[PDB]
Amino acid sequence: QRMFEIDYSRDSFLKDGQPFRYISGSIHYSRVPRFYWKDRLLKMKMAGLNAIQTYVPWNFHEPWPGQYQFSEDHDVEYFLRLAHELGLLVILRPGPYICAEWEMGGLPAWLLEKESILLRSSDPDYLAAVDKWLGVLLPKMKPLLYQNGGPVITVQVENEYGSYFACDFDYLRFLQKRFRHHLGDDVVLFTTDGAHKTFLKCGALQGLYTTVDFGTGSNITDAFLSQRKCEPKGPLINSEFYTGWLDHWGQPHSTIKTEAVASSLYDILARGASVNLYMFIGGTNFAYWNGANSPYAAQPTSYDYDAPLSEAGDLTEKYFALRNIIQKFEKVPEGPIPPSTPKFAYGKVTLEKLKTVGAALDILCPSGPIKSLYPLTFIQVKQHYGFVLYRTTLPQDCSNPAPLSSPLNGVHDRAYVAVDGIPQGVLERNNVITLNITGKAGATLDLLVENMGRVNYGAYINDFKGLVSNLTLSSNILTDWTIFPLDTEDAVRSHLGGWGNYTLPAFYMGNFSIPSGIPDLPQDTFIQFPGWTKGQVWINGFNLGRYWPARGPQLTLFVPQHILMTSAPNTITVLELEWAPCSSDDPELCAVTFVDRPVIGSS
Amino acid sequence: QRMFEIDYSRDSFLKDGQPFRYISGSIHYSRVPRFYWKDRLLKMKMAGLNAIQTYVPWNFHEPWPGQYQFSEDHDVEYFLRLAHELGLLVILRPGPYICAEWEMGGLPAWLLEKESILLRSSDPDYLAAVDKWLGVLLPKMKPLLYQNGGPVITVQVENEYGSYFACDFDYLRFLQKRFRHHLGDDVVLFTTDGAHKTFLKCGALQGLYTTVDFGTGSNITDAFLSQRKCEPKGPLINSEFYTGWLDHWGQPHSTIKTEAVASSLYDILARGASVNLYMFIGGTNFAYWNGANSPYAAQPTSYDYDAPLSEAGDLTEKYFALRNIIQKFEKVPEGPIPPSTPKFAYGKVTLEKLKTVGAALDILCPSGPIKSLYPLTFIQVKQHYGFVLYRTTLPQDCSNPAPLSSPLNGVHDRAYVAVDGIPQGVLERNNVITLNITGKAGATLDLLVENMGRVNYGAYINDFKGLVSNLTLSSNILTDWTIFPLDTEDAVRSHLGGWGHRNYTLPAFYMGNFSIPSGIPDLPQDTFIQFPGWTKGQVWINGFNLGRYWPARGPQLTLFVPQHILMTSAPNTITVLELEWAPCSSDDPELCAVTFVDRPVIGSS
């Protein structure tokens, strides 16, 4: 009969009738391959953590209504049993909105099939979806509660609701009530908000324990004074003590100094507070999982965060510093700490052109294009992530430049424009809404539109993507559209059908071998694209994510060794969006480079 | 069809009618665990080598007569296939004597069951056993000959016979006949000797191609003219170009500069000569496989040799520089080079004493001892390697120290002496032939005798080991011996019977465990083990005998520990046999401990 509870009399948690406080670090299972889940967790224990904290992204697990992913890398139950096996308790944060620099805050984009939906409110179509989701997730989590022999000790309802404009208290009351139904009356439910009465006003609720977040810049006495105003009794809790900070493409890489973190951490622990270090390891936004902030600016592939464990799991100076702080409070485990993984530079691998996007439409769109008078959104067209080709035919003649414009800023988020197979340039959400083009009447106008990531914070999380308003040409609304949803994932895995200034968006491919019978190969590596511009990359069909060395700060992408093979050659595929170094008479330039050190902080 | 031959007309080899010169590197499969064979051979290929050279040590395959080892780490057949699948050719040196800083130059100790045997001669008994070995080994090598689809292009007969006193050309001719009988008339047979007519006089034989060896100290012109005296036509060949040199316990670690090796390799290659690098990777003398020189000085566990690839297989600056040399003459393979393995510091592990050697006699010697009026040698007692316990009783009270002595200097090679369970010190071949002892009349006198390695070079390779002559106490010969051969390898694998059968301290076994976690892709890793406070002994991890430790003498302080004998979840058990002094007395356990570190210390004091 295991018990975990707040005792108010005494300003703390009781675990099994005894005083308890947690020292946790965040780890997101959706951002670390399962291959490495025990590595990262074990390193977390060795630092002195008695708990971990994680988010459950709805959209990672329910990509379409009634279609579930809980296997392999999506096996959340396994991740929690793994944490338990290693002696770690768990703080579970199941949203349904998690924020987290992740696609639409973890909300599934199919919710937007109701165009008018008010996300994160008592909108009844939103509520009915959430209830179906909780009715699949929470029964999986019930046996992993502490009270029933598992690791979960507390659960977060919603995520920083006090920061959302809606302030719908019946939304919260619904979530409480549904969580209580599936989890019982004993589980400690709580909320997390910014440490200021302005944020706690809409975020707090009777019957949910109110906690705060804040990092190294904040006055710690005040942050806790604002929590105490909402909970005069119970434990002090900083649910997200920032070890670092997010990035955006085109902005310098964020860093927080080791001593600042140590200092504040020591101060927080000395008060007897429970605390969670956000992030302890950040990892990677593989494939299309990154989020974005408003006004539109996307987060990059790497979620390194300047965390104590680096993107690839490495032990940093910051890791050891915090471990030494934790040591002043708790006996920390003995034994040697598992190492940073070995990294190998496989070198330069030559690639060659396979097919433009243009030529691969039979294989990218086997079901055929959809015809619309005006443009349709990604959502209307049944695609959530990646790329959609919008094709029209020129009505006038344009031997002289003619402005192609989205007057309402309706290219969400970036379009690669070509006319009769000649690249014209690029349109960008907020930055470039007009572009001059040329060609003949009846010439095919092509727009390859990229969803660069759905906003995850603020008001504009209802982010459809695509051409969301009309385009004009010499101010005349363009009409009659042939819209091609693109199955890039399937096409890449099948080598685009056949197996056994700007350029046109295209796929380039090449191979490299790794000898078998070598105990220490393959190893993890980092891939680099010197001379390429913007695009997507797969290795052996695994989408490692986005590259953009023309904007930075991220130049390299992380490649975990377990996708690499020795019995047959490894295939690298690059989808270049802007300009490829491959026209030239020198095939040597049409190439990528594997290196043994990340470059995630370029100027 | 496939042909490899000498073209005398043109001072070259012909490979399928095409000109061919080899750039080889020595690797000894018996000094590299099988688990890493492929790693090292690929590292060799990427250096630009097109061939490898290796020795087949007879004692490594036939530890008793008619009883063979050709599996796992002894599968030379698989080694040779592996080299062939990587596109490498092979030059085989099957002895039957190989020298090679290896126990008895590779010769099995059991040949000494005939006391008067003249090794490496027409002694009919030596010959009959050589013949029998070749009837086993050579037919396995036949399909690996180049002309039959395998990698082996040349075969060395004997090893520097010209350096040996006997000069028995009937012996050489007998080898030549039997090599022909088993392998045929087209295989290229050759000899290797020092580059000087004094060595070449007895080493060279009509019908066997004469090659020389020499290193970075020797004048290349002179060395190759000495070769031209015996073979005026055909290729130039240095079969052992020294990349480094051997070690002995107690001397500074041998090194040869990267520039000296590089510049010399260049000049040899420029003459259009075929060359083998000795060693390319040296590796390790695990167990009791090291040898020794005369006057008695044993080589240690590490055969790092200062080779281009280090003991644990690392790419050194020397490797890259030789590869650059080779590049000036040939296309070198494209692609990146497999890396240096990662090393891990598992840290301190505490040990505790389980049992003295005296206490463990029952399990070390389960068929019981041999009784004898005078002492017997390792050979007569049917033991070749390791330790033998000799026991007798004092025939007179020695309350005043009385001298125990081996007048003819016959403690071969080290004895650890105890009286009624009290240690008295050490007798040493050459250095200390007298030890004073105290005890009562009829007290038990125990000598723990260690074979430190049979001599591998010179006239004194018939090195029996043990008490090879009498002992005296107060000048009187001690009689009535009880002699226990010790099956240390079995006993350690059963944890001294514990796991069943499915100033000095007494020699004793010290055990401790350590765990390594599972589900971590990068553990276990290669490591090095170090013995602060200990003195001299043997070490095993999970029953694999990693060799001898002697931090008291050096130059080697760490022993190499390869990853594949370490296990996850299940406890890893360390067994240290300390012979002289363990740090395990003081009421402080933390000192009774060994330590695992991530860099080797073979180059210290």
Ligand SMILES: CCCCNC(=S)N1C[C@H](O)[C@@H](O)[C@@H](O)[C@H]1CO
């Ligand atoms: C710069 C805008 C702030 C948005 N993010 C906020 S407030 N954060 C708190 C939020 O709960 C968490 O998911 C993370 O998103 C964290 C920042 O990494």
Ligand SMILES: CCCCNC(=S)N1C[C@H](O)[C@@H](O)[C@@H](O)[C@H]1CO
């Ligand atoms: C100190 C005596 C050395 C004798 N060894 C000689 S001459 N050498 C030549 C011999 O062929 C080889 O096996 C090696 O033993 C080499 C030394 O590494």
Ligand SMILES: *[C@@H]1O[C@H](CO)[C@@H](O)[C@H](O)[C@H]1NC(C)=O
């Ligand atoms: C934090 O604020 C308090 C008042 O709430 C003030 O006394 C204290 O000095 C401040 N501490 C720091 C470090 O600024």
Ligand SMILES: *[C@@H]1O[C@H](CO)[C@@H](O)[C@H](O)[C@H]1NC(C)=O
């Ligand atoms: C397009 O070209 C016209 C005429 O050359 C020019 O006036 C206008 O500024 C251009 N607009 C853009 C966005 O380049």
Ligand SMILES: *[C@@H]1O[C@H](CO)[C@@H](O)[C@H](O)[C@H]1NC(C)=O
């Ligand atoms: C585009 O323009 C038409 C006609 O002006 C308008 O009625 C329609 O709503 C617009 N469609 C989009 C997607 O903007």
Ligand SMILES: *[C@@H]1O[C@H](CO)[C@@H](O)[C@H](O)[C@H]1NC(C)=O
């Ligand atoms: C795979 O590897 C090489 C790269 O060197 C490439 O050129 C070759 O065509 C590829 N083969 C297949 C079957 O894809």
Ligand SMILES: *[C@@H]1O[C@H](CO)[C@@H](O)[C@H](O)[C@H]1NC(C)=O
């Ligand atoms: C080596 O010896 C030869 C004598 O045969 C001599 O001609 C030459 O000077 C020497 N060469 C070198 C490089 O020492």
Ligand SMILES: *[C@@H]1O[C@H](CO)[C@@H](O)[C@H](O)[C@H]1NC(C)=O
């Ligand atoms: C042994 O003891 C005698 C004293 O009887 C002494 O002369 C001699 O030096 C000692 N020998 C050794 C080898 O220590």
Ligand SMILES: *[C@@H]1O[C@H](CO)[C@@H](O)[C@H](O)[C@H]1NC(C)=O
């Ligand atoms: C031991 O002693 C006696 C001398 O009486 C001699 O007969 C015998 O050969 C000696 N044995 C050895 C092994 O030295």
Ligand SMILES: *[C@@H]1O[C@H](CO)[C@@H](O)[C@H](O)[C@H]1NC(C)=O
């Ligand atoms: C060490 O090794 C094995 C592990 O099963 C066992 O026989 C021995 O009793 C162990 N002792 C300790 C302290 O782990």
Ligand SMILES: [Cl-]
């Ligand atoms: Cl989290």
Ligand SMILES: [Cl-]
């Ligand atoms: Cl060799």
